[PDB]
Amino acid sequence: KWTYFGPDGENSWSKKYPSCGGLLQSPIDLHSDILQYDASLTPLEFQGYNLSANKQFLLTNNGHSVKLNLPSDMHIQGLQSRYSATQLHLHWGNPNDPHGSEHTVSGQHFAAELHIVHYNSDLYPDASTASNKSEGLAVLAVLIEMGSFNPSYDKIFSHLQHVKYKGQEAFVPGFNIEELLPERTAEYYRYRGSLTTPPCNPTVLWTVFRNPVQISQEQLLALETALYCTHMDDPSPREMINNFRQVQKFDERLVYTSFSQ
């Protein structure tokens, strides 16, 4: 019921999902005029990220992204409540315009962006219930650029051929999810925002790491070309590309940084 293009694209999400036209929408451009150092922003700790290599985690193509389900023993420590993981997924562009991050920095897109979605398990029983509630969600965002081959991202990307079409599903052996995070995770942007997809609820505490990670040219091309947003038997297949929302206006507000330097 929604897409990133045509008449069911982002300008039309607010018809069926009214929060997509409401306050606190994400993503936003992170630029110097709206940044403010806040010494209250201490390092997060990533607990239970080293997933059992004896467990399997479900990877899906849900027609909007590729998603890896995560166990609720994985969590962020350092916020006021515990936030437990529920899933990760990615956003990207296309080979002719390979600049499909959702957040931008000083007006510039990165190649792609990883989101690790968490919910407030101290207040709410599960992610779905949390998603529309106060303090409900926290997302860690990693900016991705082209560079050296990244073995850790390949622990996900090596499975993409098995989830080519909408509805398909693959099992990924546990690995250390912290390997997907960049250098100096102490350095981050922090703001209160929204889901960047429908239903766009304004219930997300965003942490965007300052430093990007690298993946190779081949890995980025794989991500951009491996998936379709249609079911296997659709007689009009569509490639899953450009699955990012445009930046939203952000006026009279700050993004807090854990770094001044």
Added chain:
Amino acid sequence: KWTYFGPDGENSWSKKYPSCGGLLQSPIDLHSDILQYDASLTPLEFQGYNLSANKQFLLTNNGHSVKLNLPSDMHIQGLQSRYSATQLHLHWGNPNDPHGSEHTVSGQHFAAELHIVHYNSDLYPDASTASNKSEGLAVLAVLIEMGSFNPSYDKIFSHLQHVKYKGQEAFVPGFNIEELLPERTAEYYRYRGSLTTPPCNPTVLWTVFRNPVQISQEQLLALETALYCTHMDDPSPREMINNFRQVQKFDERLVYTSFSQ
């Protein structure tokens, strides 16, 4: 009562104005991956732009911008039909953040943007009729940077305290409208797009000049503080600020440039 902020803002325009959720939407970010030189983009000529100083032209606050009405003897030569002027208007930011252009270049906003709207007068008897027809309109867009005081722009801005409220009108003596255009008008970006306001009809041939003009901080501050979207008697006044649309997905379009480097 569409606006640029709050529940009637741009993510909701498609609820009432379906073409705002359609294809070919403007404005866009002008960046290298989608640019392509086209040697057939020869220079436009601006005919009848030197308006007599002994004549006067109506300036109006239309609740969304300030607009100057232009005579149909003013036209562009060099497109495949004659396009005659109908009006010019601006888009801008706000006093604390003067970054309100509609088009961006390599991710960066300019301070403001001037649009000079023309319609195909060879085919249509007026701009409203043209506005519904493919390439019915042609707009010239000038990017505006904070810089030196600009006496030519001030021929418009010096009247702003007289059109402070929606529906108000003032007369502006004629001046040479070509003085609002930048240097090297032969260098431009060209693309097929839309109105950037409701009803967002995809019927505009866009020409965005490569080079910006400058107006001063004081001229921007006057533009950003003088006007209201509301009538003079409205008990809930709204300042006319931040009257620009976010950039839109490309939808596979390229932008053609008359300059190669």
